[PDB]
Design a binder for this molecule. Structure first.
Ligand SMILES: CC(=O)N[C@@H]1[C@@H](O)[C@H](O)[C@@H](CO)O[C@H]1O
Ligand SMILES: CC(=O)N[C@@H]1[C@@H](O)[C@H](O)[C@@H](CO)O[C@H]1O
Ligand SMILES: [Ca+2]
Lengths: 177, 545
């Protein structure tokens, strides 16, 4: 945390973006970056869900204490986790993300660039990127730690979360440090 | 901003490739302002000597000023008065042709040039939008130069840009591999847009408000462009008039063989691709075009190949699911596009006869769906579907049904998917069925609005004492309609809603509802344009094999 900080907490505690329905980008490449600190066994950390009628989605998730991505742009679900790491302790980590189609690339703070290249023949594009659900409350499994200084395709999610700009929707047990 | 008069008479716009000095010109209409014109501007480097059959590199650079004040020659095209691509051109061409050729003569391969129309009026309520026009035909003909934008440019206060792009044999030749991958045309087009993206600002333009729009066979490119690795960034909204990238004559699936017909027929027999391409390169902007290569009835010889890059897979599979971005898209087809389908077989009484109706269906199932040898069922089904069992005899009804098939099966039916698939994934999709047309000689008295009748209403020619090309006797209505048309076309380019920035509500298309706009003399909004018959072609048909 060296930016516009934001806390997270017990019970119900999840944020919701909502792109303006006529305005749902869909890219070839997605660029997520966000630096957290949790203490929870199972969970969902963040999630862009596309829209209705669309199984395209992108979900960083705290399975087994290993914050690990899982996504379907079209055909099968891809998944880049680093399954060695009890990092879900309260410690702070700056977990970045790259994607060009099926090719993707995770990278926790400074460690190696663990990357997957599903050989099948994946599809290039997300579709109708609509809602960004940071919290996992609406997924069934919640998350209790924090995040900060967010960056996403050049759209600052949590500098704009405190400006209270139009499109944000904040309903949870949460703060600003 | 110095020689006030003489330097505002014909302006002086700094490109990144130099300064161009254009030309201010007013318009004849009463309620219509002047428009700055920069005719014959360069967007690439001449696809000359070496470049030929290779993608297009930037244009060069000068100092001082460069007179951009006349349309440069256009590309390799030769037009056999008949023995062209007849059946899918636009009515206003397949005849009239004669002196629709003040833009034929004057052909130099050094051809990649575009035209810029900028509205003079001061908008001091902000930078104006842009509209790049991909001109159609069947590839291998035509120019942007035959359509003058200024009328539109001015009316909507939007910048209009016609382009020239490589053509036909120079512009779409593919071995299908390595030495000549293909798709050179839509690639200059792409450079035209990346030139525009870069420079249009310095005229008066907003590169975030670029809309590409085409005339059917030109719309092909515009639909094909939605689907490219290359297109992303260069435009936002597209209007795709009178056809798609699924038309049987949109995509060329065997330039394999149709380059071999031309290779052998030019002293280029070598049976190794890279050897052969260097042959045709060292021939001539001549010779290679003066060759008659006949495509298979209802296909093209030289056209867009599915190379692997610019066009990455089958348009049907790409559209079918993912892979376009999100384009604010407005598309629609005319009532009786087909028309040219019932050539000759309409008597001077005014209809087609039954055992001439049947030979037509059976030189349709025979042409398009070769190999299946089920067909016949198809055939006796096709022709069950397209007879009116109320007026079983009535031979005018039987004439209309015929054109109405082709029309359904080559524009409407495909243009409803595309229209369906875009709504499906985020894109706002607005839809229109064009019913009105300007009526004149060349085009019979009974023809409903045929392919390419949409054009002059979109460009505003009914605000101007007609033309060659568009030699039709215009009414007061034609004016009043064009006004409604250009406002819907413009407003769409300005925002994402032909309505928004004394008329009717359009509203978005979207497969639950399927609202279309019925652009006739009185526009009314209807729903499910031809549902039953479009659902025929796109359902119980590929149900065979
Ligand atoms: C466009 C054209 O045909 N001629 C003009 C001419 O008037 C002018 O003197 C010179 C540019 O300075 O060349 C150009
Ligand atoms: C617009 C229309 O329907 N008819 C007019 C007709 O009145 C006129 O005599 C002539 C002018 O060329 O033809 C046209
Ligand atoms: Ca997808």
């Amino acid at each position: 945390h060296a930016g516009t900080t934001y806390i997270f907490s017990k019970g119900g505690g999840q944020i919701t973006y909502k792109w303006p329905p006529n305005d749902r980008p869909s890219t070839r490449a997605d660029r997520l970056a966000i630096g957290f600190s949790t203490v929870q066994k199972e969970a969902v950390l963040v999630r862009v869900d596309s829209s209705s009628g669309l199984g395209d989605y992108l979900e960083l998730h705290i399975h087994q204490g290993k914050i690990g991505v899982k996504f379907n742009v079209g055909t099968d679900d891809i998944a880049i986790e680093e399954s060695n790491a009890i990092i879900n302790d309260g410690k702070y980590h700056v977990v970045r993300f790259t994607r060009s189609g099926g090719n993707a690339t995770l990278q926790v703070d400074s460690w190696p660039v663990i990357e997957r290249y599903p050989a099948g023949r994946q599809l290039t594009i997300f579709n109708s990127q609509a809602t960004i659900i940071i919290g996992g409350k609406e997924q069934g499994q919640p998350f209790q730690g924090q995040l900060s200084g967010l960056y996403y395709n050049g759209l600052k999610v949590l500098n704009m979360a405190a400006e209270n700009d139009a499109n944000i929707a904040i309903v949870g047990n949460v703060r600003l440090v | 901003d110095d020689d006030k008069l003489a330097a505002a008479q014909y302006p002086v716009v700094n490109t990144n490739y130099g300064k161009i000095r254009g030309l201010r010109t007013p318009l004849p209409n009463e309620i219509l302002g002047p428009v700055e014109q920069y005719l014959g501007v360069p967007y690439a480097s001449p696809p000359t000597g070496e470049r030929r059959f290779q993608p297009p590199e930037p244009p060069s650079s000068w100092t001082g000023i460069r007179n951009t004040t006349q349309f440069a020659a256009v590309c390799p095209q030769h037009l056999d008065e008949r023995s062209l691509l007849h059946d899918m051109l636009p009515i206003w061409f397949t005849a009239n042709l004669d002196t629709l050729m003040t833009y034929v003569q004057d052909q130099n391969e050094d051809c990649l040039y575009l035209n810029i129309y900028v509205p003079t009026e001061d908008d001091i309520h902000s930078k104006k939008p842009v509209m790049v026009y991909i001109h159609g035909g069947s590839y291998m003909e035509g120019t942007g130069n035959m359509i003058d934008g200024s009328i539109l440019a001015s009316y909507g206060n939007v910048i209009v840009i016609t382009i020239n792009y490589r053509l036909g044999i120079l512009g779409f030749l593919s071995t299908g591999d390595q030495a000549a991958k293909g798709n050179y045309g839509l690639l200059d087009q792409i450079q035209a847009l990346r030139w525009i993206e870069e420079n249009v600002g310095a005229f008066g333009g907003d590169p975030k408000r670029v809309t590409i729009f085409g005339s059917g066979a030109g719309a092909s490119c515009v639909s094909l462009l939605t689907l490219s690795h290359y297109s992303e960034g260069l435009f936002q909204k597209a209007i795709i008039q009178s056809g798609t990238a699924l038309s049987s004559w949109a995509v060329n699936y065997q330039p394999a063989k149709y380059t071999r017909i031309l290779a052998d027929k030019v002293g280029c027999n070598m049976l190794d691709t890279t050897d052969m391409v260097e042959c045709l390169r060292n021939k001539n902007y001549k010779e290679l075009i003066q060759q008659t290569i006949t495509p298979a009835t209802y296909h093209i010889a030289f056209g867009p190949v599915i190379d692997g890059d610019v066009i990455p897979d089958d348009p049907q599979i790409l559209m079918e699911q993912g892979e376009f971005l999100n384009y604010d898209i407005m598309l629609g087809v005319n009532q009786g596009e087909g028309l040219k389908f019932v050539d000759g077989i309409v008597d001077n009484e005014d209809g087609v006869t039954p055992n001439d109706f049947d030979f037509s269906v059976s030189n349709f199932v025979d042409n398009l769906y070769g190999y299946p040898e089920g067909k016949d069922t198809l055939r006796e089904t096709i022709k069950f579907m397209y007879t009116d069992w109320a007026d079983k005899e009535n031979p005018e009804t039987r004439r209309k049904t015929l054109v109405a098939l082709f029309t359904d099966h080559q524009w409407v039916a495909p243009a409803v998917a595309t229209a369906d698939l875009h709504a499906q994934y985020g894109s706002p999709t607005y839809f229109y069925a064009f019913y009105h047309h300007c009526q004149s000689e060349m085009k019979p008295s009974w023809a409903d609005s045929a392919h390419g009748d949409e054009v002059p209403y979109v460009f505003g020619i009914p605000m101007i004492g007609p033309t060659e090309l568009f030699s039709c006797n215009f009414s007061k209505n034609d004016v009043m309609l064009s006004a409604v048309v250009m406002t819907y076309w413009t407003n769409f380019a300005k925002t994402g809603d032909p309505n928004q920035p004394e008329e009717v509500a359009w509203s978005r298309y979207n497969p639950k509802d399927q609202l279309y706009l019925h652009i006739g003399l009185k526009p009314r909004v209807r729903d499910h344009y031809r549902a039953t018959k479009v659902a025929f072609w796109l359902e119980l048909v590929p149900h065979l094999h």
